């Protein structure tokens, strides 16, 4: 209805938000680090990083952290404003319960925010930002690459038997647990690695056979330039077969090594074919999500308690809540739209969910309080 | 109040914007390159690049450049429209000053845009998009890696003394100026590099000791598969100790090399632990920021001059400005909200800052002109 008192007290809340944001902007960076610790922990250690799209995203993130810190630390102020707004005397034996109201609301919001952070943030960020199936396969592939590297070192030392043994073991382990161009590129890299290892190892005596193997690899590269991947594969197979002649007594062993290389290449291609959705997390989106969660859970823990405390003395009877449930749902949905920075219905519903839950818990608490009062009377 | 003349002249401005955007769309790419030169120059030479998130971001960027070029080159048109809008005769000895008004406003906007570009853009893009502390450390790490590579080449040539000398010097230089898994992976890579260098160098005589070293490395990889990083570190240390036996007279030297490798690995891990915020700049955000800055500074240089020129003849007395200061601040804030594409209060304030500054400079200039006129009279 009227604006005067509402506008004045909204101005009080706004100036409180401004001053507390000014003070909290000093420690914006430590607060941002604390907020980002859960999401970073949920990320893999090898890719524990966040990207920033814009050049002012540091400034935007710091300003958002300051604004949200101000609005969080002004909750006692808005609680006092709300308590003063409704004060018809309230049977002044019951109007003295101001400090209990403000204190209970403040600790309710603080506990909601703390529980949000500690419980929800690590668990949910583990739920979303973790695959646990492609990561295990990637780790298995990295381990297999390490065993292949060890086999190549054994080859470089002139130990064909140990290299073949390791190659067979790795192939068995991989079997127990893709575009043509990509697979051909991987196979070419594997052939180059095997040729380099053989050149380092048996390059003092069998200099005439590695020359033929390298010529066959050159033929493979030529058949890879003009896309004739069948000829490229045939040339790589011939190169490996000739490479097997550097150690005639361990030919099978060398063959096994080549097989492993091919397998690894194939496997890697399969992995890069399977993972068409890589993570690249952003500063502002993650900050917005974390702040939205904390604010939503603070609302969830505060609105029921504030409503119940009003109902103990009586400012909102159950009749008014039942009459205005639909309008309250709508106004909560508009508030969720305002808070959410992204203009999508999905985020609107995700934000409005906590608001509706808080309202429902509040009305349940009010009804329970009224029933207990009636039973006592 | 009425719409007729306002709507007609707004239509004139809109059609002018449309035609100048149509002509300026021809040279959208060179203008975009000129606009992106400062931000690219502020970026490191090794990562002097911009990413585009969407497939139509080229088209969106070109269209935005064309629209903003049209609105920039239509400033004389809107100046003529404004001058014509207020013309009650203006004591027609003073109404003839139309061309001075339009010309002065046009050159004011052009000078504001040029100063914005040349002064602000390089300096501020250097301020934000430059770390200068992690980049120096990264360059030091790259140089240390280069010295380690030179030491490894000296080892590959059979020169253990020179390799040890370089390793000691690099370790001293690094000392003068992290997850367990990542550090173990880096140490494994360093051990592999050292083993490869030793195999290339002393692989003609000490073929029996590098075999034991490679077996110990295999044990390290096994203890790395099942996460037992303590055993992995012990196995790597044993592998390096055995590698030291290839040259018994230079054992310490080889030890030093291994130490350097470990140190480098550790250092690299520390760096990747410290840098949790990598840059990945986008086309549209950077273009929006640059265009916003240029438009804001054009407003800063134009609005005071336009207001002062109106005050010389008199269309806006100081009384009207003092009365409508609050409404003017609000309308400038809504204009800043309209211009800014991102729906955040931070960008709204960042845009509205220049508008308020322009209004304040305009009112100061109007007051100074009035005071000078009163003193003359």
């Amino acid at each position: 209805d009227h604006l005067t008192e509402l506008r004045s007290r909204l101005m009080r809340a706004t100036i409180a938000v401004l001053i507390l944001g000014t003070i909290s902007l000093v420690f914006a960076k430590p607060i941002f680090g604390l907020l980002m610790q859960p999401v970073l922990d949920a990320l893999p250690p090898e890719n524990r990083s966040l990207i920033y799209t814009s050049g002012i995203e540091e400034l935007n993130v710091l300003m958002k952290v300051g604004v949200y810190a101000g609005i969080f630390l002004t909750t006692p102020v808005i609680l006092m404003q709300i308590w003063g707004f409704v004060s018809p005397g309230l049977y002044p034996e019951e109007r003295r319960f101001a400090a209990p109201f403000v204190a209970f609301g403040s600790i309710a919001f603080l506990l909601g925010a703390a529980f949000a952070y500690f419980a929800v943030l690590p668990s949910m960020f583990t739920f979303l930002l973790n695959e646990e199936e492609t990561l295990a396969l990637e780790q298995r592939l990295d381990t297999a690459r390490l065993r292949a590297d060890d086999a190549l070192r054994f080859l470089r030392l002139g130990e064909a038997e140990e290299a073949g043994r390791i190659a067979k073991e790795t192939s068995t382990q991989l079997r127990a647990e893709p575009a043509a161009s990509v697979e051909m590129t991987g196979r070419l890299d594997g052939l180059g690695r095997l040729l380099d290892a053989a050149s380092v190892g048996y390059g003092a005596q069998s200099r005439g056979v590695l020359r033929q193997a390298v010529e066959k690899r050159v033929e493979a590269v030529t058949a890879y330039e003009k896309k004739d991947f069948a000829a490229a594969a045939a040339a790589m197979d011939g190169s490996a077969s000739l490479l097997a002649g550097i150690a005639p007594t361990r030919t099978e062993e060398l063959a096994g090594l080549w097989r492993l290389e091919k397998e690894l290449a194939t496997a890697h291609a399969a992995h890069e074919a399977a993972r068409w959705t890589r993570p690249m997390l952003s500063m502002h989106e993650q900050l917005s999500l974390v702040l939205l969660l904390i604010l939503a859970f603070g609302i969830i823990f505060e609105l029921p308690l504030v409503m119940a405390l009003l109902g103990v003395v009586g400012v909102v009877k159950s009749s008014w809540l039942f009459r205005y449930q639909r309008h309250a749902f709508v106004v909560a949905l508009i508030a969720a739209a305002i808070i959410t920075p992204t203009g999508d219905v999905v985020n609107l519903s995700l934000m409005a969910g906590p608001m509706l839950l808080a309202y429902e818990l509040g009305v349940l608490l009010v009804w329970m309080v009224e029933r207990r009062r009636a039973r006592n009377s | 109040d009425h719409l007729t003349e306002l709507r007609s002249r707004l239509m004139r401005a809109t059609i002018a914007v449309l035609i100048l955007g149509t002509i300026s769309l021809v040279f959208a790419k060179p203008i975009f390159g000129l606009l992106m030169q400062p931000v690219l120059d502020a970026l490191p030479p090794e990562n002097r690049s911009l990413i585009y998130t969407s497939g139509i971001e080229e088209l969106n960027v070109l269209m935005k450049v064309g629209v903003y070029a049209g609105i920039f080159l239509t400033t004389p048109v809107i100046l003529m429209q404004i001058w014509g809008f207020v013309s009650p005769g203006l004591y027609p000895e003073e109404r003839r000053f139309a061309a001075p008004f339009v010309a002065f406003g046009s050159i004011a906007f052009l000078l504001g845009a040029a100063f914005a570009y040349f002064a602000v853009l390089p300096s501020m893009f250097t301020f934000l998009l430059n770390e200068e502390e992690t980049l120096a450390l990264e360059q030091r790490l790259d140089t240390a890696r280069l010295r380690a590579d030179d030491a490894l080449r000296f080892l590959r040539l059979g020169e253990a003394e020179e390799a040890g000398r370089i390793a000691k010097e690099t370790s001293t230089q690094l000392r003068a100026e992290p997850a367990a898994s990542v550090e173990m992976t880096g140490r494994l890579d360093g051990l592999g590099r050292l083993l490869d260098a030793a195999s290339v160098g002393y692989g003609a005589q000490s073929r029996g000791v590098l075999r034991q070293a490679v077996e110990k490395r295999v044990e390290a990889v096994t203890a790395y598969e099942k996460k037992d990083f303590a055993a992995a570190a012990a196995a790597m240390d044993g592998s390096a100790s055995l590698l030291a036996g290839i040259a018994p007279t230079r054992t310490e030297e080889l030890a030093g090399l291994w130490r350097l490798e470990k140190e480098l690995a550790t250092a690299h891990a520390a760096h990747e632990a410290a840098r949790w915020t990598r840059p990945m700049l986008s086309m549209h955000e950077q273009l929006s920021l640059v265009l916003l800055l240029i438009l804001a500074f054009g407003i800063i240089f134009e609005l005071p001059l336009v207001m002062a020129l109106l005050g010389v003849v008199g269309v806006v007395k100081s009384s009207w400005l003092f009365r409508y200061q609050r409404h003017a601040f609000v309308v400038a804030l809504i204009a800043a909200a309209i211009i800014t594409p991102t729906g955040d209060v931070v960008n709204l304030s960042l845009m509205a800052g220049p508008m308020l500054l322009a209004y304040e400079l305009g009112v100061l200039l109007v007051w100074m002109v009035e005071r000078r006129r009163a003193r003359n009279s």
Partner: peptide, 18 residues
């Protein structure tokens, strides 16, 4: 957006005061 709208509304109600 909604944030810009609520900001302009807050400013409009703020300049006039109670």
């Amino acid at each position: 957006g909604a944030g810009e709208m609520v900001f302009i509304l807050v400013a409009a109600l703020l300049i006039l005061g109670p």
